[PDB]
């Protein structure tokens, strides 16, 4: 179902908040984003690792030179933080991702895994910044 | 769900500042902030 899949869908307005928040490679790794390829076609790629580009780009007000290790089943390449879509998982794109995972041999992550992963975001949101994170943020 | 919006005294950036937090701007380590204007009804007699 593409509706339960949208709970762990990372939108564009959420990344902006967590550009400099540590534990980054532990909250986003396991969710699915709606990345752009390009004409209105889209594919559901897998957040695998946290990579960094040599290309500094401005995202509205904010600027981030980082990358994203995404992969649609077997086709993997580099990605930037600008091309993600706020659009939710549609039906045609949900079945297309299902066919890219059945075609690659990757197991579909069990729904209980998605239910325990969507809550990591809400606890990371409400996180009290008592430790030495503001410092590393302004640095 | 209101996070109490402060303005940095030197960056002039908006900052979201809940309880039990250091009063620091998140742009640069400046230590003065100001509250933004009220949302209440402000009315004057031109008088």
């Amino acid at each position: 179902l593409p509706e339960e899949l949208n709970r762990v869908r990372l939108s564009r307005h959420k990344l902006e908040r967590w550009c400099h928040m540590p534990f980054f490679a532990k909250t986003v790794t396991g969710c699915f984003v709606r990345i752009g390829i390009g004409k209105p076609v889209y594919r559901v790629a897998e957040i695998t690792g946290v990579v960094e580009t040599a290309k500094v780009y401005q995202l509205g007000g904010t600027r981030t030179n980082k990358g994203l290790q995404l992969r649609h089943g077997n086709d993997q390449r580099v990605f930037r933080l600008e091309f993600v879509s706020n659009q939710e998982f549609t039906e045609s794109e949900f079945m297309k991702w299902k066919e890219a995972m059945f075609s690659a041999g990757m197991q579909l992550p069990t729904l209980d895994e998605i239910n325990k992963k969507e809550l990591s975001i809400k606890e990371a949101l409400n996180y009290k910044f008592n430790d030495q994170d503001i410092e590393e943020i302004v640095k | 769900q209101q996070p109490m919006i402060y303005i940095c005294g030197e960056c002039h950036t908006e900052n979201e500042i809940k309880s039990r937090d250091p009063i620091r701007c998140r742009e640069c380590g400046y230590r003065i902030m100001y509250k933004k204007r009220t949302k209440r009804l402000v009315v004057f007699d031109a008088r």
């Binding site: 939108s11 307005h13 959420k14 752009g36 390829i37 390009g38 706020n86 659009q87 | 769900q1």
Partner: peptide
């Protein structure tokens, strides 16, 4: 104040560059 999109702000494509 979680996702105020209202669509969006013209999302740039990857195959456009």
């Amino acid at each position: 104040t979680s996702t105020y999109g209202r669509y969006g702000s013209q999302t740039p494509m990857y195959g456009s560059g």
